[PDB]
From a paper:
Crystallization trials showed the crystals of purified hTNAP could grow in both acidic and basic pH conditions diffracting to about 5–10 Å resolution. In both structures determined with hTNAP crystals grown in acidic and basic pH conditions, four TNAP dimers, i.e., protomers A-B, C-D, E-F, and G-H, form an X-shape homo-octamer stabilized with the molecular contacts among protomers B, F, D, and H. The TNAP octamer is maintained with four major interfaces between dimeric TNAPs. Two pairs of dimers, A-B/C-D and E-F/G-H, first form two tetramers with a large interface (interface L) comprising residues from helices 1–3, 18, and 20 via a series of static electric interactions and hydrogen bonds among H79 and D25/D31, E35, and H78, K38/K45 and E311, S364-S368, and T366-T366 from the contacting protomers. The tetramers A/B/C/D and E/F/G/H then dimerize to form the octamer with two small interfaces (interface S) comprising H7, H14, and some loops. Interestingly, multiple HPP-associated mutation sites were mapped in interface L and S, including D156, K264, A492, and C497 from interface S and Y28, E311, T366, and S368 from interface L. The crystallographic analysis of hTNAP has uncovered an unexpected octameric structure that has not been observed in other previously reported AP structures. However, the disruption of the hTNAP function resulting from mutations on the octameric interface implies that hTNAP may be stabilized by octamerization, which prevents the interfaces from exposure. The conserved catalytic residue S110 was solved as the unphosphorylated form in all the protomers, which serve as a nucleophile in attacking the phosphorous. However, once released into circulation upon the PIPLC cleavage, TNAP can polymerize into its oligomeric form.
HPP patients exhibit hypo-mineralization and osteopenia due to the deficiency or malfunction of tissue non-specific [name] (TNAP), which catalyzes the hydrolysis of phosphate-containing molecules outside the cells, promoting the deposition of hydroxyapatite in the extracellular matrix. Several proteins enriched in the matrix vesicles supply sufficient phosphate for the crystallization of hydroxyapatite, and among them, the TNAP catalyzes the hydrolysis reaction using the pyrophosphate and organic phosphate esters as the substrates, such as pyrophosphate (PPi), pyridoxal phosphate (PLP) and phosphoethanolamine (PEA). The catalytic center of hTNAP is comprised of the catalytic residue S110 and three metal binding sites, one for Mg2+ and two for Zn2+ (1 and 2). The calcium-binding site includes the acidic residues E235, E291, and D306 forming strong static electric interactions with the Ca2+ ion, as well as R223, Y236, and T305 stabilizing the local conformation of the binding pocket.
Residue numbers in the entry:
A (entry chain H), B (entry chain G): 18 to 501
C (entry chain F): 18 to 500
D (entry chain D): 129 to 257
C-alpha cells in the first residue's frame, strides 16, 4: 500500500526522535507507592498473538494495522517472562498462575500450592500451601476483585484464592471419592470459604454454585447447564450469608443488572453470567451477557471506594480457548477485547498510584508468516501459491491442533473455503483434538509506580514479587520502610 | 524431573527477592557516554527461537534446561521491536536492516534507501540513500567493523555500507543490463568504495571479489567457487590500495592466519573465509574456518585501539538460513553460537563505556510445545501421541516449509526416524520449498550506557537512534552538550 | 492525497456507528463528586483557532492533519460560551476572567470585582469584590494552584486571588500615585496577601516581587528585568512567611529546580521562571525554562497530596500574545503545547473524581481558508492566486493587526517571502500595532463528574457555577445533600 | 468483639459473629484513635476496641490451647497489631506479650516472669512499625 508520508526519511526520523525524547523523560522514575494494583492476564497471549492482535485492532479501523498501537503497547516498560512449570517444559493454565499470583513455581495442574505436591494425590496438600497476592492485598486493607471470561473456578482465577491438587476439581461432582473423603474441598467451595470478603467476583460458573440438577436461571431447557453440587449447597446463598447484613451485597446474572447497579452504593458483588465459560465476544449476546470491558469498568468503580487502595486481577481468559480450538479469529478478537478493557482501566485510574501489569501465563503455537504485503488482512492469504503443492495458504498457521485437514491424501485447497469465517481453523502440522501451549516466553507490559522493576529476562514468579513490593503488601515491606 | 531444591517455596521466594534486589539497583541509571557500541544481530532470531536456544545451551551442560540464562538473558533492559516493512507485513532481511542500522523503514528487498526507491528500479536510488550508524560512527572518528557469518554482502551487513535497489545485486554478474546501463554499482563494489576505510571486514563472499572464472584459493577444483566479476576488478586488491600508506593492512582467508595476526599491530583487516556463506557452526572445519566468537574477538582487539571508540556489527546470520531450511537443530545452534560471541564481547569491553544492543531483524514460523515434561530434549518428542491419527510428534513444529511429510495421505510416523539429527526438518503445516519469516515482534536486549532508553514496544527503526544518541554521533549530539 | 480508506463508504459508516455507540454509553451520566477540579484556559483560543491547531498537531506527525484528534477534541461535552464583557461587545483578558472564574461578568479592565467598579477608580473597589472558585475551593479545604505562561499577576491569573480596579497595576511601580493614596494593593502584593496559602503558583512575573533597581537572578546584565517594588518588599520572603509552622516552602526559578523537586516534600511551591512573560514555546530555553506540560505535571504531583482534592487553574496565556502580534505560527504552537499539557492532566488523574474543563476567555480575528487541498500546510498558500491582483495569498489571514503590508500602493507578493517562518505575520485588512480580540463565541470542553451540565449556549459567567456545584464548594452545594 | 452466638473458648464459633467497636467506626471515618489503659493493652477492656476473640484469656498464642491455634484463630496481641493497623496511640502494659518467647525485658532483665511469650517468634513492635 505504502502510505505516502512513509516514503520520507524525515517522517521516520522525526518519529524515532520523539520516541527518544519520551525515553529520556522516562528516566525520572515513579518511586511512589501503589495505592491500587491491577493485573491483566491474557490467558495464552504469546508474543505472536500480541502482534497479530495489534494488526487486527487497527484493521478494524480500515488501517493497515501493523502501524497501530495497542493499549498494552503504550506501557513504558516491557520484559520477558520464563513460564515453564517445575513439572513440565510447556506449562499449563494453573501452575503458571501459582507462579504469577503466589510468587512460587509449582507443578502443572495445581493452584495455590507449591512444588511439594503432586497432582491429584490429595493428602500432599497441607503444609504446602502458598497464599496469593490477592490474599496479601485483603489482609492489608485493600479491596480485591476478580474478573474473567472463564469459570470463576477455572485454572487462572483459582490461584488467587484456592489451594487444590487438581485444576479439574471444579465442584465435588467432578472430584473422585478419595479426595472428597480425604477432606479436600472443591474450588467452587474455596471461592466462598477461603476469603469471604472478596469485594468483586465476576465471570462464569453458575452451575457449580447450585444444588445438583437445579435448573439454570438463564436456560431451563438445558440439562448440561443444570447445577452440579452434590453438597446440595446454594453457594450463591452461602456467599450472601458470609457478608454482613448492614452492607449491600448484590448477586447479578445478566448484563442488564450490571449496567443498572449504582457503584457508589454496592459493597460486594457476585456476577455469574453463564453456567460455565462465558461467551466468545464474537458470540456474545448484546442483551443478556456483558462484555469484559463492561465488567471491568463496573468492577473498578466498586473497588475505587476503598481508601486503602485495591487489587484487581482481570483474566482475558478466553484467548487460550480460541487457540486451543484452532479458531484464531476468536483468539484474536478475544485479545483485542482485553485491550479495550486495558484502555478503560487507564481512564478510571492514574499512573501516579496505580501499578498495572498486562502479561500472559504462557503462549501458543500460533504463527503468521508468508511475506504478506502491508495491510493484508490477518485472516487473509499469503501472496502466492505454495512452492510445492501449488495451492494457496493462510498467513496464520498453527503448529498443531484441529486445523490439520488432508482431504483425501492431500491438504485442503482453502481457496473455496472461507478462511475469513469466525470459526475457521487454520491448518497445522500435527492433528490433535486441541492445539497445545507454547514454551516460548511471554511479554510483561508494566505501567505506573515501580513498573521499571519488571525488567530483562526474569522467571515468571518474579511478577507478583514486584507488585507486592510496590504496594507495601505481602512479605517484603521495604518500599514503605523508613530504613530504605 | 522436578528438581528437589525447587520444591521449597523458600527457594523461589529467595530467588525473586534476589532478582528484586538487582532490579532496585538498576534504578541507578547508567548515564555515561557510549565510547563503543556493539550490535549483535541474529538473522531471524524470534522470541520463540531465543527461548528454544536457551534450553539447548543448558542441555549441552546436562542441566534440565528451562532455568538457564543465555549470555543475552543477562542484559538488564528488554524491549519489543515492531518489525514490519513499509511494503510487506511479513518483512525480509534487507529492509529491516535498513531500519535497525539506518533508522529509516524501507521497502522489502532494498538496502540503504528510503521507501521512495522501488525495488530493482535503478533510477529510483539517487536522492533516496540514507546512511548508516556505521557511517555516522566513522564520521565521528571511530573504528568500524562488520563481522558476519553470511556473505559480507548479504542483505543484512550490506545495509551498513551500501545503498542498492535490490538485495540481490551481489556482484555485477547478478545485475540486469539496464541496471548497469543506469550506473548503480553492485554491492561487493560498494563494500570496497563507499566507505574506503572500514577497519574490520570479516565473513564470506570471497568469490564476489575476484573477476569471472577464477579458481578459488580454497576450493581450487570447485566450479561454483570461481569469481563472478565482469568488472575484471580484483576488489581484495582494490581494498588494499585505498588504505593509508604507513598503515599495516592484512587479508586472510583461512582460520590459521586469523590467530597468527598480532592485533596490536594490524590496522585494516579483511577476512573472507568462504566463496559464499560460511558453513553452519555444526559443519565447521576446525582447520580452515573460524567461529563467530573467534572472528568477533580478533575484531574487537583490532578496534579497541582507537581511543575514540568503535562501532562493531556482528551478525549471527545463519540462524535465518537454519529456519529457512527447516533444520531447527541448525538454527538453534547458530543462535547459541551467537550467544557465545555475546559473552566473548562482554569480557573484552566494559559496561561503563560499551552499549551492547542485541536484537533480530524478524522472526520465523518456528514454535515449540507438546506439553513436554521438564528437562525434555528440545529436539525430542512430545510425551503422548496424536489424538487424531495416534502417531507421535516433535515438540518443535513449523508453520510452513520443507518438513511437510505425507507418506500416503498419512503423515510420517516419526518413531521411524532420527528426529534428533542436525539436518532433521521438523514438520510443517504447508509444504513450501523454504520456510517463511514470521511477522511478529522481536526482542531487543541492551546493556551499557543509556541502555534503559530501549524500553518499550517501539518501531524497529528506533534502535540506531538510541545507539547514535548514547554515543554522541550522527544527528542528535544532545548526550554530550553541557546538559547533566 | 485522498487516503485509500476514505474512498470506502463502509469506513465512514463504521466510524460513525462507533462514534454513536460511544454516544449512547455516555447516557450513563457521571454524577460523582468532583473531588478535584482542573480548569484549562487557552487565552484567545477561539473556535477557528482550535481547528487550525488540530491540523498543526497532526501535521507535525506528517499527517494531512484535519482527521487528527486534539486532546480536548476527546472531551465528551462541548458548549458555546457568550464572551461579551458588561461594558464591551468584544471583550478583554481580565473582565472575562472575572466571569469564568468568579461567576460574575464585569467591566473590561477589572479583575475580581463586579460591574459596579469603573476602571482606574479605586474608590469603587471598596465593597464590590467577588470571590473566585480558587478561593471557594481553598475555603472548603482543597489545595489550590495557578500555573501560567504569562506573568502570575497578569490579567487572567489575577482573577483567582486579586480584586483590583485596573489590570495594569501589576506592581506598585505601575500604579498612579492617585490610586496608591486611595489605599489599593497591586496584583503582586495581592497574590501573597489575600489568599496566603495558595499551594502552587507557577509562571512569569518575577520582577514584581523584588525591590526596585534590584538586579535579577537569571538575566542580571539587563534592567528591564530588575526589581520594580517601590514598597521595598521582598514578596518571595513575604510569601515564605505566612506558611504554617512545620511546612516546606521552596521558591524555584529555573527548569532544573522544577524536576529536582520531590513532590512528597513540597507543601507550598512558588516558581517564577522569567522576569516578565515566559518565553513562547518555540523560543524557550530547553535548559533554564520549563514547558507548560512540565509545570502542569509537578503542579499536579504536589496537589494530589491533599485528601480533600484540589483545584488547578492552567492558562495557556501566550496564544493571545501570538495572535495579538499577528504571528500565527507562535499562536498555534502555544495552543498545541497546552494540548500536550491537557493530555498529561488526563493520565495523572481519573475522570471518575476529576472534572476538568477546557475553554478560552475570548477569540481573535484569526481566520483560515482559501479552498486549500487536503493536507495543505496550515502555514501554506491557497492553491490559486488572487483573481484580482494575480498574486498568491496565505491560507491563514487576519481581520486586523500588524500583518497588513502594502509595498507602494501594492499588496505584498508573498512567494518572495518566508511565510512559513516562526514570526511571519500573515496579511490583514486593517494595519494596527497589535491585532484585536474577536467578539464571537468560544467552545467549552468538559470531562468527568457533572461534565454534561456544561451543555448549550450559555453566558460565560455560568462556568465556575457548574464547577462549584460539582465539587460541592461555594455558594450552592446541594450535590452533596444526604438524600 | 463477638456477638452472643459465640461460645467461650470454642474458636470455630467466631466467624460471622464479629461485631466491630466504636474505635473501628471512628478510624473508618478518618479520626485518629488511641487506647490508653493501665492494664495490659491486650487485657479484657481495651481488647474489645480492636480484637474479636472467644476467650479473653488468650493474651498471646502462648496462652492459647492448641486446637484454638489449630482452628486458626490468632491471639489478642496479634490482633492488636493486625486488625486495625493504624491505631494512632496505644499505651499501657503488656510488653511481654509482644516479643518472642524468652527475650529478656528491656526494663527487668533479671525476671523469670517478664520474658517474652510469643511462640510465633514474632516481634510485634516491628510488626507494628
Ligand atoms: C435480568 O435479571 C433480572 C432479575 O432482576 C430480570 O428481571 C426480572 O424478570 C422477571 C421475569 O418477568 C420479573 O418477574 C422480575 O420482577 C424482574 N426483576 C427485576 C428486578 O426487574 C431481567 O428480565 C433479566 N434480563 C434478561 C435479559 O434476562
Ligand atoms: C484450487 O481451487 C481453485 C478454485 O476452487 C482452482 O482454480 C480454479 O479452477 C477453475 C477450473 O475451471 C477456474 O474456472 C477458476 O478460475 C480457477 N481459479 C479460481 C480462483 O477459482 C485451482 O486450480 C485449485 N488448485 C488445486 C491445486 O487444487
Ligand atoms: C593459510 O594461508 C596461508 C597463506 O595463504 C598458507 O600458507 C602458504 O603456503 C604456501 C606453500 O608453499 C606458501 O608458498 C605461501 O607463501 C604461504 N603463505 C604464507 C602467507 O605463509 C597456508 O597454507 C594456509 N593454511 C591453511 C590451513 O589453509
Ligand atoms: C509407528 O512406528 C512404530 C515403530 O516403527 C510402531 O511401533 C512399533 O511397531 C513394532 C511392529 O513390529 C512393534 O513390535 C513395537 O513394539 C512398536 N512399538 C515401538 C515403541 O517400537 C507404531 O505401531 C507405528 N504407529 C503407526 C500408527 O504407524
Ligand atoms: C538553577 O538554580 C539553582 C539554585 O537556584 C542554581 O544553583 C546554584 O549553583 C551555584 C553554582 O553555579 C551555587 O553557587 C548556588 O549556591 C546555587 N544556588 C542555590 C540557591 O543553592 C543553578 O545554577 C541554576 N541552574 C541554571 C541552569 O540556571
Ligand atoms: C510574484 O512574484 C513572482 C516571483 O516571486 C513572479 O514570478 C516570476 O516573474 C518573472 C518575471 O516577471 C519570471 O521570469 C519568473 O519565472 C516568475 N516566477 C518565479 C517563481 O519567479 C510573479 O510574476 C509575481 N506576480 C506579481 C503579480 O507580482
Ligand atoms: C497419602 O495416602 C497414601 C495412601 O495411598 C499413602 O501411601 C501416602 O504415604 C500418604 N501420604 C502422606 C504424606 O502421608
Ligand atoms: C449487536 O448490535 C449490532 C448493532 O449494530 C448488531 O448488528 C449485532 O447483530 C448485535 N449482536 C450480535 C451478536 O449479532
Ligand atoms: C525510470 O526509468 C524508466 C525506464 O525507462 C523510465 O521509463 C521512467 O520514466 C523513469 N522514471 C521517471 C520518474 O521518469
Ligand atoms: C573439531 O575438533 C574437535 C576436537 O578439536 C573434534 O573432536 C571434532 O570432532 C571436530 N569437529 C568437526 C565438525 O570437525
Ligand atoms: C472618588 O471618586 C470621585 C469620582 O467622581 C472623585 O471625584 C473623587 O476625587 C474620589 N475621591 C477622592 C478622595 O479623591
Ligand atoms: C532544544 O533541544 C533540541 C535537542 O533535540 C535542539 O535540537 C534544539 O535546537 C534546542 N533548542 C533550544 C532553543 O534550546
Ligand atoms: C465447631 O466444631 C465442632 C466439632 O469440634 C463442629 O461439629 C461444629 O460444626 C463447629 N462449628 C461450626 C459453626 O462449624
Ligand atoms: Ca448471561
Ligand atoms: Ca575457509
Ligand atoms: Ca528562566
Ligand atoms: Mg484459563
Ligand atoms: Mg542476513
Ligand atoms: Mg492572560
Ligand atoms: Mg479491664
Ligand atoms: Zn493458560
Ligand atoms: Zn490452556
Ligand atoms: Zn534475516
Ligand atoms: Zn485574553
Ligand atoms: Zn489579549
Amino acid at each position: 500500500l505504502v502510505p505516502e508520508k512513509e516514503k520520507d526519511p524525515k517522517y521516520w526520523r522525526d518519529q524515532a526522535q520523539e520516541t527518544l525524547k519520551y525515553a529520556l523523560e522516562l528516566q525520572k522514575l515513579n518511586t511512589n507507592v501503589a495505592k491500587n494494583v491491577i493485573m491483566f492476564l491474557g490467558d495464552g497471549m504469546g508474543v505472536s498473538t500480541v502482534t497479530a492482535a495489534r494488526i487486527l485492532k487497527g484493521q478494524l479501523h480500515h488501517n493497515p494495522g501493523e502501524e497501530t498501537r495497542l493499549e498494552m503497547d503504550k506501557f513504558p516498560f516491557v520484559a520477558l517472562s520464563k513460564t515453564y512449570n517445575t513439572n513440565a517444559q510447556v506449562p499449563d493454565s494453573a501452575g503458571t498462575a501459582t507462579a504469577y499470583l503466589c510468587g512460587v513455581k509449582a507443578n502443572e495442574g495445581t493452584v495455590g500450592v507449591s512444588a511439594a505436591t503432586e497432582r491429584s494425590r490429595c493428602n500432599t496438600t497441607q503444609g504446602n500451601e502458598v497464599t496469593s497476592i490477592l490474599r496479601w492485598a485483603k489482609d492489608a486493607g485493600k479491596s480485591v476483585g476478580i474478573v474473567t471470561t472463564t469459570r470463576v473456578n477455572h485454572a487462572t482465577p483459582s490461584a488467587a484464592y484456592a489451594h487444590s491438587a487438581d485444576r479439574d476439581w471444579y465442584s465435588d461432582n467432578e472430584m473422585p471419592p478419595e479426595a472428597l473423603s480425604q477432606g479436600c474441598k472443591d474450588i467452587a467451595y474455596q471461592l466462598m470459604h477461603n476469603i469471604r470478603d472478596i469485594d468483586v467476583i465476576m465471570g462464569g460458573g453458575r452451575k457449580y454454585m447450585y444444588p445438583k440438577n437445579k435448573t439454570d436461571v438463564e436456560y431451563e431447557s438445558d440439562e448440561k447447564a443444570r447445577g452440579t453440587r452434590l453438597d446440595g449447597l446454594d453457594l450463591v446463598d452461602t456467599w450472601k450469608s458470609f457478608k454482613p447484613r448492614y452492607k449491600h451485597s448484590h448477586f447479578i446474572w445478566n448484563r442488564t443488572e450490571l449496567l443498572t447497579l449504582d457503584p457508589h452504593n454496592v459493597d460486594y458483588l457476585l456476577g455469574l453470567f453463564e453456567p460455565g465459560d462465558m461467551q466468545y465476544e464474537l458470540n456474545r449476546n448484546n442483551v443478556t451477557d456483558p462484555s469484559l470491558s463492561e465488567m471491568v469498568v463496573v468492577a473498578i468503580q466498586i473497588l475505587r471506594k476503598n481508601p486503602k487502595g485495591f487489587f484487581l486481577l482481570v483474566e482475558g481468559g478466553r484467548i487460550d480457548h480460541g487457540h486451543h480450538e484452532g479458531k484464531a479469529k476468536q483468539a484474536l478478537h478475544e485479545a483485542v477485547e482485553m485491550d479495550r478493557a486495558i484502555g478503560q482501566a487507564g481512564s478510571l485510574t492514574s499512573s501516579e498510584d496505580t501499578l498495572t501489569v498486562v502479561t500472559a501465563d504462557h503462549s501458543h503455537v500460533f504463527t503468521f508468516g508468508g511475506y504478506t504485503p502491508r495491510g493484508n488482512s490477518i485472516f487473509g492469504l499469503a501472496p502466492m501459491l505454495s512452492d510445492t503443492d501449488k495451492k494457496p495458504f493462510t498467513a496464520i498457521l498453527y503448529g498443531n491442533g484441529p486445523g490439520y485437514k488432508v482431504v483425501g491424501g492431500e491438504r485442503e485447497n482453502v481457496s473455496m473455503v472461507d478462511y475469513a469465517h469466525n470459526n475457521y481453523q487454520a491448518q497445522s502440522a500435527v492433528p490433535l483434538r486441541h492445539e497445545t501451549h507454547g514454551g516460548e516466553d511471554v511479554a510483561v507490559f508494566s505501567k505506573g509506580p515501580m513498573a521499571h522493576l519488571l525488567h530483562g529476562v526474569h522467571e515468571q514468579n518474579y511478577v507478583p514479587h514486584v507488585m507486592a513490593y510496590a504496594a507495601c503488601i505481602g512479605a517484603n515491606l521495604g518500599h514503605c520502610a523508613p530504613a530504605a
